[PDB]
Amino acid sequence: SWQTYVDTNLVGTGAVTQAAILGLDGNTWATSAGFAVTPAQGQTLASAFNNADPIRASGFDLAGVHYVTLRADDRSIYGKKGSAGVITVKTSKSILVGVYNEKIQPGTAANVVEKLADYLIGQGF
């Protein structure tokens, strides 16, 4: 199911320390050990993909960590907190959340998230 993508293709690459797969309702379909995106944080992110405005001035929360919004559009939402950050990408039916920390190059983490997203969109997800 989606848990393979979280364990192998996302956290397994060592490019992200935490990750989850959400449906468009903001609910979790698969999450890494201990990573918990509350449905409310999930729904807040899911809507941001339509109306980013509410997320731009005050950022957004994800599992107890608050991030400032760097860029947000119809496909991806990037945020950060010092040297940590998260790449969130929307596919046709899900939302990929990939968190990284100060030991990971943000560019390396965007490469993995944006491309897995491209791969699932290609499979029709």
mmCIF file of C-alpha atoms in Angstrom, residues 9 18 21 28 36 43-46 48 50 53-54 64 67 69 74-75 86 91 102 112 115 121 124:
data_model
loop_
_atom_site.group_PDB
_atom_site.id
_atom_site.type_symbol
_atom_site.label_atom_id
_atom_site.label_comp_id
_atom_site.label_asym_id
_atom_site.label_seq_id
_atom_site.Cartn_x
_atom_site.Cartn_y
_atom_site.Cartn_z
ATOM 1 C CA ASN A 9 10.998 5.471 -1.499
ATOM 2 C CA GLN A 18 10.018 11.809 8.319
ATOM 3 C CA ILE A 21 1.017 10.100 2.482
ATOM 4 C CA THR A 28 -3.107 9.916 6.703
ATOM 5 C CA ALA A 36 1.873 12.233 13.182
ATOM 6 C CA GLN A 43 -6.792 19.431 6.027
ATOM 7 C CA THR A 44 -5.091 22.854 6.437
ATOM 8 C CA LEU A 45 -2.363 21.780 3.999
ATOM 9 C CA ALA A 46 -4.812 20.188 1.544
ATOM 10 C CA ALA A 48 -3.603 25.500 0.978
ATOM 11 C CA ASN A 50 -6.282 25.633 -3.508
ATOM 12 C CA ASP A 53 -3.366 32.722 1.365
ATOM 13 C CA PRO A 54 -4.176 31.565 4.859
ATOM 14 C CA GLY A 64 4.327 19.837 16.344
ATOM 15 C CA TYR A 67 7.204 26.069 9.276
ATOM 16 C CA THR A 69 5.894 29.116 3.854
ATOM 17 C CA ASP A 74 -1.040 24.204 -7.187
ATOM 18 C CA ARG A 75 1.502 21.403 -7.028
ATOM 19 C CA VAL A 86 9.394 20.042 4.423
ATOM 20 C CA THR A 91 -0.574 14.214 -6.984
ATOM 21 C CA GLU A 102 19.831 20.225 9.117
ATOM 22 C CA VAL A 112 13.171 12.745 -4.078
ATOM 23 C CA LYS A 115 10.066 12.931 -8.432
ATOM 24 C CA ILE A 121 0.972 10.900 -11.077
ATOM 25 C CA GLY A 124 -2.587 7.736 -12.122
#
